[PDB]
Design a protein around this ligand. Structure first.
Ligand SMILES: [Mg+2]
Ligand SMILES: [Mg+2]
Length: 343
């Protein structure tokens, strides 16, 4: 069904490991949860109160409040099961498993897109600000000087008073991982012609952060494929919704820019993170000849893939939102990593 992302050097077996942070070593007692596993499940246990809300007030679901209880209950129970016996529920657990257990408790209860009214108002407001945000970047005559603006916009699209305000108030540089200089150097040579991008959140993150960036690439001579979730996971943008967003934005041009090279792909993903060894077949066909891959969101670029090796130039970009992630990286909360690996 799923196939390995084409830019992952083969063989991927015993080499590519999606997860970025290990919570257990082979030498650890298999019947006792490790301090780390224990502390990481807390990141997921502390996600419930906020998930049981977007679910209980989901008016599209009949008797949502009761069902949200079944959610909090079943998910907390599973989390306790793992702390007591890390081998059950498919453990040892990693970030991917914990995310999947959350989506499963919810879906089994009949949920498909519990983040609907949110994503709607998200794109709702973002759509009313695209021309303003785009015009600016264009007003920036220098290409590299401009590249930075868009790169900061990607980071601002994360947490977000306004998107533009948030764009000028990121944590000070050097950023946790700061490969921007090396990236800007190659960007000015403009040698990329096949970019693919694994997007994350709806609204400003996709509309004001990623799309203006994608538009600049097209304006410099590249094809761009945006890979989005097949199924709703948090406020993440799915391929279906992204097609609707661009359909509205687009002479089929994005504020004067031709989009014939703007392609949308269904990564086949259904989590806020992603395992690149297993994706849709469509995604790979479209990314079969890519020379610029990009995985956005703390999940897709840092929790997973941060150290993934690719056959072509690579860049993981996302804002750090977990204190635990900041700790593993030795960074600040809301730090921005810009990791670029040439060749
Ligand atoms: Mg997200
Ligand atoms: Mg996560």
């Amino acid at each position: 069904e799923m196939v390995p992302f084409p830019q992952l050097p083969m063989p991927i077996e015993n080499n590519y490991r999606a997860c970025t942070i290990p919570y257990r070593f082979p030498s650890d007692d298999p019947k006792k949860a490790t301090p780390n596993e224990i502390s990481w499940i807390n990141v997921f246990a502390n996600s419930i109160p906020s998930f049981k809300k977007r679910a209980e007030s989901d008016i599209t679901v009949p008797d949502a409040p009761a069902r949200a209880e079944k959610f909090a209950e079943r998910y907390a129970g599973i989390l306790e099961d793992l702390k007591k016996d890390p081998e059950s529920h498919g453990g040892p657990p990693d970030g991917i498993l914990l995310c999947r257990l959350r989506e499963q408790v919810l879906r089994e209860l009949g949920f498909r897109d519990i983040f609907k009214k949110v994503k709607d108002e998200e794109n709702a407001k973002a759509i009313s600000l695209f021309p303003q945000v785009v015009s600016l970047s264009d007003a920036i005559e220098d290409d590299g000087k401009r590249l930075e603006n868009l790169v900061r916009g990607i980071f601002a699209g994360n947490i977000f008073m306004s998107f533009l305000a948030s764009c000028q108030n990121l944590v000070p540089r050097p950023w946790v991982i700061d490969d921007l200089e090396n990236f800007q150097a190659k960007w000015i040579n403009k040698s990329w012609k096949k970019a693919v991008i694994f997007v994350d959140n709806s609204g400003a993150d996709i509309i004001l952060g990623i799309l203006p960036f994608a538009r600049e690439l097209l304006r410099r001579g590249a094809q761009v494929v945006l890979a989005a979730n097949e199924l709703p996971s948090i406020n993440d943008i799915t391929c279906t919704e992204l097609t609707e967003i661009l359909s509205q934005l687009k002479n089929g041009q994005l504020l004067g820019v031709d989009t014939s090279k703007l392609l949308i792909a269904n990564s086949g993903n259904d989590l806020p993170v992603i395992d690149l060894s297993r994706v849709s077949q469509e995604l790979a066909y479209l990314s079969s000849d890519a020379d610029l891959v990009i995985v956005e969101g703390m999940g897709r670029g840092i929790e997973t893939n941060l150290y993934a090796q690719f056959k072509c130039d690579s860049l993981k970009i996302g804002m750090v939102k977990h204190l635990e992630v900041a700790e593993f990286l030795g960074g600040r909360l809301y730090d921005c990593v810009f990791k670029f690996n040439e060749v």
